Design a protein around this ligand. Sequence first.
Ligand SMILES: Nc1c(Cl)c(Cl)nc(C(=O)O)c1Cl
Ligand SMILES: Nc1c(Cl)c(Cl)nc(C(=O)O)c1Cl
Lengths: 140, 140
Amino acid sequence: RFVDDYLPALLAQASQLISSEFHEVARQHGFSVSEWRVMASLAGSEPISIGQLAQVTVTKQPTVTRLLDRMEARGQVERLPHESDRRITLVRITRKGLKAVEHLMELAREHERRVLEPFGLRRAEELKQTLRQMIDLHVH
Amino acid sequence: RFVDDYLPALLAQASQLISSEFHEVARQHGFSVSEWRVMASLAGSEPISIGQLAQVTVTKQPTVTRLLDRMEARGQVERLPHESDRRITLVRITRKGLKAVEHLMELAREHERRVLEPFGLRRAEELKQTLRQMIDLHVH
Ligand SMILES: Nc1c(Cl)c(Cl)nc(C(=O)O)c1Cl
Ligand SMILES: Nc1c(Cl)c(Cl)nc(C(=O)O)c1Cl
């Protein structure tokens, strides 16, 4: 059966199943999926472009811009001009956003550890390395 | 940076990037993403339940049911009663659907081979095995 070992189907199912487990925790802590993705992606990061944020959060850019309108209104993120290009807007998490998301990030790390524990450190690191290499080869 | 090596973020980005490449081919051949997922998932398969189809295609069940309404109208799939449970509807691809999707499936295999070639057979098989094991541990 083609679909049983078709890579894009395997990636999508694993991603949906693992993510859906953590989304229940995020909601119990008052976060939407998109708010969790944005704050977790900006935590501990230097300011990044809207386009970079859209790529790492797998969210369409117009959706990200609307999300940032409301997250900035709530003081959780800040948009700022690029030091050179008028075309580029950068975005950062604020202290308020970081404090709001820190505990959830620790829960996310615990959930990830539980997901990866049956595989062992070797297989877990190999998976993460392969995924990172694939992203870096296919990102635009 | 948390997000740089957070497994759910890595899975989601790799899945989105790889899938988006193939979706361009599917559309050039007249398929929507959802039609491609359904027909490819049913190709060469015995009839499966709507719930199984929704899981493997990562599509919400009500969306799948509406999709099947129109795909069945076009003669590409068929819904049939479960041999035991009135609660369960099964679904299969028809010959018309299989003939419509066969060439696209060969293109999908070629694209997958190109995605996996830089990694080598060992790393490719390890990735697929880990993803399959994760799905089977997290599916409900
Ligand atoms: N791209 C993602 C990022 Cl950045 C984070 Cl933190 N979480 C998730 C998830 O929903 O599991 C995703 Cl897909
Ligand atoms: N779940 C999926 C299945 Cl069954 C197929 Cl054939 N293709 C894709 C894709 O869009 O790349 C997905 Cl996610």
